[PDB]
Amino acid sequence: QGITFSKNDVEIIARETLYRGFFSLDLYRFRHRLFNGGMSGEITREIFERGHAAVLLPFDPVRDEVVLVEQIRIAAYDTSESPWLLEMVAGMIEAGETVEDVARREALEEAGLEVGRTKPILSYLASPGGTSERLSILVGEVDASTAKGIHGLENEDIRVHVVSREQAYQWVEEGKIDNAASVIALQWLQLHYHNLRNEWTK
Amino acid sequence: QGITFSKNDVEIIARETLYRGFFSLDLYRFRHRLFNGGMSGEITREIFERGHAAVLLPFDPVRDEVVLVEQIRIAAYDTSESPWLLEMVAGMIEAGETVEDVARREALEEAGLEVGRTKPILSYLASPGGTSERLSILVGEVDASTAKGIHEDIRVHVVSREQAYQWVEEGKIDNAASVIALQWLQLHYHNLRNEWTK
Lengths: 202, 198
Ligand SMILES: Nc1ncnc2c1ncn2[C@@H]1O[C@H](COP(=O)(O)OP(=O)(O)O)[C@@H](O)[C@H]1O
Ligand SMILES: Nc1ncnc2c1ncn2[C@@H]1O[C@H](COP(=O)(O)OP(=O)(O)O)[C@@H](O)[C@H]1O
Hints:
Chain A contains three helices and eleven strands. Chain A has helices spanning 99-111, 165-174, 180-201; strands at 10-20, 24-32, 43-49, 53-60, 65-72, 84-87, 89-92, 118-125, 134-141, 150-151, 158-164.
């Protein structure tokens, strides 16, 4: 059961940068084994390269509350009612950094929050047909009574919102929260909150 | 309650396509209202533009089974054990096409599955800091005993819902579309099975 082939079964022949900016778009050239027993010819694919991210679900297990951050994401404009989105604390992971270090720094910068205990949620590929981006989600213990106000640096303007867990999940169901990181984190929380609250309120 | 500002509160000054091949790399220049009052300066952002997708979770409510499709996704290589991923059926939405039409077509093309009833799951932005992509997920009723074969090189897998969900927990399924769909299924399968096996 499970997948069929490993890295022994694919060769990346070359990568060619197509666009070099803040992010990049690369052409990967590769060959790989086929399910029918053969080898592919040389395949090329365009891949959006933007590094990888740490994501923090700020959860108050005493109050059963979730902290959301609101900020504009202009890429949402063409398909969304508003480009202002309700999201998880998050940031890019630079060389040598840990997911936790980034999550804690961003919790302070984006939401004014200290974080207590932390546990992994899941690490996922955002859209692996066209981007390499991986985002690694943690849940972080917070005191939601300390979450409030306007944060961010400059080019960054972020409003904190505090909701109950059930309210946040209702917002997912209704489409008011509709970005992958937040949907994944809040679905996970709906599946795990009973044990998590028990663990963190012993 | 909820969000603070609307499209009346942002001005998109310019858009440019800086790279066009199979996909596009766009540059947006804009200014927007600030929470404390007033308007930002001009901001520029690179946006990966690839259109939008329909996704189908193939669920057999009689058997409590899901059909997964396996194919190489080279973008996964640098951060994954293998670039071959277990995924939901999916495809691009072309002009004037509906999510449902694309989902049903891709289920046949990628997995050989006829779909019965469908229901919406959720529609989500994959990574809206850097890509415009939206994906809209449906759950589709299938007979998993009909799913087999090779179907772009794609292998069809049938597993119990419980195994697919445990693979999410274990990190063996770790692409957004599948994680979202299977967590939704874990939250909703009991009512869905009742609804579809009357
Ligand atoms: N990253 C990419 N770069 C270049 N071409 C692509 C890429 N992804 C998909 N395509 C083209 O689209 C076709 C169908 O895409 P597919 O592999 O089914 O992925 P998806 O269904 O997510 O678009 C492929 O055979 C390929 O020719
Ligand atoms: N899509 C993008 N295009 C260009 N630059 C970006 C993009 N995303 C992030 N950056 C750069 O990285 C910085 C930190 O990213 P982030 O805090 O996620 O964005 P924002 O400032 O919009 O909240 C931004 O201030 C910006 O300078």
